[PDB]
Design a protein around this nucleic acid. Sequence first.
DNA 1: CCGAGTACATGCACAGGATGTATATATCTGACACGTGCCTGGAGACTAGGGAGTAATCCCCTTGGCGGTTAAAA
Length: 49
Amino acid sequence: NIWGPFLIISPASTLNNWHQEFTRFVPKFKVLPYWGNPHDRKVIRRFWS
DNA sequence: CCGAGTACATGCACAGGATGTATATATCTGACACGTGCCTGGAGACTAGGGAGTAATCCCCTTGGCGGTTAAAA
C-alpha cells in the first residue's frame, strides 16, 4: 500500500496545516493537495492524469 | 376488545459555508495625440460670357362626375 495512491479527506482550512506538517514530517514524500477552481483542476488533471 | 400513551421515525425550517460571479484596480504598451515645417493640390476672389428654365398665356385632351345592369361580394 506504500506505492499505491492514497486519498486523504481533510478540511480546506486544515489542508495547509497538513501540508506543512507532512512536509516537515516526511520530506521524502510528495504532498499534492487538490483545491482551487477549474483552472487548478486542469493543472491537477495534467499533473495527476 | 378499545382507548390511552410512550417511543421511534420523519419532515420542515433555519443557519453555516462553499463556490460562482462581477466589478474595482494596476500596469506597461500599441496607438491615438501633438508639434515642425513642405508644398501642391485645392479654395476662393475677380471679370467676362453663355444659357436654360421661370413666367404668362392658351389650345386641347383626359379626368371627375351623372344613372343603369347584371356580376361578384357577402
